Protein backbone atom coordinates (compact mmCIF):
# COMPACT_ATOMS: atom_id res chain seq x y z
CA UNK A 1 0.00 0.00 0.00
CA UNK A 2 2.44 2.55 0.83
CA UNK A 3 4.83 1.75 -2.17
CA UNK A 4 1.83 2.28 -4.48
CA UNK A 5 0.35 5.22 -2.73
CA UNK A 6 3.88 6.85 -3.13
CA UNK A 7 4.30 5.42 -6.92
CA UNK A 8 1.05 7.63 -8.33
CA UNK A 9 2.07 10.66 -6.15
CA UNK A 10 5.66 10.49 -7.66
CA UNK A 11 4.76 9.52 -11.56
CA UNK A 12 4.29 13.06 -12.56
CA UNK A 13 7.43 14.48 -12.99
CA UNK A 14 8.80 11.44 -15.25
CA UNK A 15 5.46 12.41 -17.05
CA UNK A 16 3.90 9.38 -16.90
CA UNK A 17 0.37 8.92 -17.04
CA UNK A 18 -1.16 5.69 -14.67
CA UNK A 19 -3.05 2.43 -15.79
CA UNK A 20 -6.20 1.59 -14.70
CA UNK A 21 -4.07 -1.65 -13.38
CA UNK A 22 -2.22 -0.03 -11.07
CA UNK A 23 -5.10 2.10 -10.29
CA UNK A 24 -7.16 -0.92 -8.90
CA UNK A 25 -4.36 -2.80 -7.24
CA UNK A 26 -3.53 0.68 -5.28
CA UNK A 27 -7.07 0.90 -4.54
CA UNK A 28 -7.65 -2.74 -3.17
CA UNK A 29 -4.39 -2.70 -0.99
CA UNK A 30 -5.16 0.81 0.46
CA UNK A 31 -8.86 -0.79 1.27
CA UNK A 32 -7.19 -3.57 2.97
CA UNK A 33 -5.07 -1.79 5.30
CA UNK A 34 -8.16 0.81 5.91
CA UNK A 35 -9.71 -2.39 7.28
CA UNK A 36 -6.83 -3.33 9.62
CA UNK A 37 -7.22 0.10 10.99
CA UNK A 38 -10.83 0.10 11.63
CA UNK A 39 -12.14 1.32 15.11
CA UNK A 40 -15.93 1.65 14.85
CA UNK A 41 -16.61 3.09 18.73
CA UNK A 42 -19.73 2.56 20.51
CA UNK A 43 -22.61 5.16 21.49
CA UNK A 44 -22.10 5.67 25.57
CA UNK A 45 -25.09 6.55 27.58
CA UNK A 46 -26.26 10.20 27.42
CA UNK A 47 -25.86 10.59 31.37
CA UNK A 48 -29.68 11.34 32.74
CA UNK A 49 -30.97 8.25 31.49
CA UNK A 50 -32.21 6.38 34.52
CA UNK A 51 -30.89 3.03 35.61
CA UNK A 52 -33.85 0.68 35.94
CA UNK A 53 -35.26 -0.01 39.31
CA UNK A 54 -33.95 -4.09 38.48
CA UNK A 55 -30.39 -3.36 38.85
CA UNK A 56 -30.17 -3.48 42.47
CA UNK A 57 -29.13 -0.21 43.84
CA UNK A 58 -28.04 0.67 47.70
CA UNK A 59 -26.35 -2.66 47.33
CA UNK A 60 -24.45 -2.99 44.30
CA UNK A 61 -22.00 -0.53 43.09
CA UNK A 62 -24.49 1.46 40.44
CA UNK A 63 -26.28 4.30 41.15
CA UNK A 64 -29.68 5.22 39.97
CA UNK A 65 -28.20 6.75 37.00
CA UNK A 66 -25.52 6.05 33.89
CA UNK A 67 -22.02 8.06 35.32
CA UNK A 68 -22.35 9.33 31.54
CA UNK A 69 -18.22 9.78 31.61
CA UNK A 70 -15.36 7.33 32.34
CA UNK A 71 -16.93 5.86 35.86
CA UNK A 72 -14.47 5.83 39.01
CA UNK A 73 -11.95 3.32 38.77
CA UNK A 74 -9.62 3.67 41.69
CA UNK A 75 -10.76 6.58 44.51
CA UNK A 76 -7.30 7.49 45.36
CA UNK A 77 -7.54 9.76 41.99
CA UNK A 78 -11.13 11.04 42.07
CA UNK A 79 -11.12 14.13 39.89
CA UNK A 80 -10.82 12.28 36.79
CA UNK B 1 -21.29 -5.53 27.29
CA UNK B 2 -18.07 -4.60 27.36
CA UNK B 3 -18.80 -1.21 24.98
CA UNK B 4 -15.84 0.25 24.37
CA UNK B 5 -13.05 -0.38 27.50
CA UNK B 6 -16.07 -0.20 30.33
CA UNK B 7 -18.89 -2.48 31.67
CA UNK B 8 -22.20 -0.64 31.07
CA UNK B 9 -25.37 -2.74 32.50
CA UNK B 10 -28.35 -3.24 30.42
CA UNK B 11 -31.03 -0.78 31.77
CA UNK B 12 -33.76 -3.35 33.71
CA UNK B 13 -37.24 -1.36 34.47
CA UNK B 14 -39.54 -2.80 36.77
CA UNK B 15 -43.48 -2.24 36.46
CA UNK B 16 -45.48 -4.75 38.71
CA UNK B 17 -48.46 -5.45 37.00
CA UNK B 18 -49.50 -8.95 39.13
CA UNK B 19 -49.63 -7.90 42.67
CA UNK B 20 -53.31 -6.12 42.14
CA UNK B 21 -55.58 -9.20 42.27
CA UNK B 22 -53.52 -11.06 45.02
CA UNK B 23 -54.48 -7.58 46.71
CA UNK B 24 -57.92 -8.07 46.02
CA UNK B 25 -57.81 -11.60 47.52
CA UNK B 26 -55.92 -10.66 50.29
CA UNK B 27 -58.42 -7.72 50.98
CA UNK B 28 -62.01 -9.82 50.21
CA UNK B 29 -60.41 -12.08 53.36
CA UNK B 30 -59.68 -9.63 55.99
CA UNK B 31 -62.95 -8.22 55.20
CA UNK B 32 -64.92 -11.39 55.86
CA UNK B 33 -62.24 -13.54 58.73
CA UNK B 34 -63.93 -16.39 59.96
CA UNK B 35 -63.10 -18.76 62.91
CA UNK B 36 -63.87 -22.27 64.43
CA UNK B 37 -67.67 -22.81 65.23
CA UNK B 38 -68.74 -25.87 67.40
CA UNK B 39 -72.10 -27.06 66.61
CA UNK B 40 -74.71 -29.18 68.80
CA UNK B 41 -76.46 -32.40 68.60
CA UNK B 42 -79.60 -33.84 69.86
CA UNK B 43 -79.01 -34.07 73.32
CA UNK B 44 -79.76 -31.93 76.32
CA UNK B 45 -76.71 -30.66 77.03
CA UNK B 46 -75.47 -30.18 74.26
CA UNK B 47 -76.03 -26.89 74.28
CA UNK B 48 -74.29 -25.67 77.48
CA UNK B 49 -71.44 -28.01 76.27
CA UNK B 50 -70.94 -26.03 73.08
CA UNK B 51 -71.15 -23.05 74.55
Same mark, same amino acid.
Do not use: C, H, W
Given at each position: ??????? %?? !?????????????? #?????????? !????????? !?????????????????????????????????????? | ? $??? +???? $??? $?????????? %?????? +????????? $????????? #? +? +????
Amino acid at each position: AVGYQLL %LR !MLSDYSLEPTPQVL #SNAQRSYDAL !MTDTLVVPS !MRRRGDFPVGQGNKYDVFTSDRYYPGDLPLIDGDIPNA | T $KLD +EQFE $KYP $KFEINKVATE %LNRIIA +EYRNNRITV $KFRPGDREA #S +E +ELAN
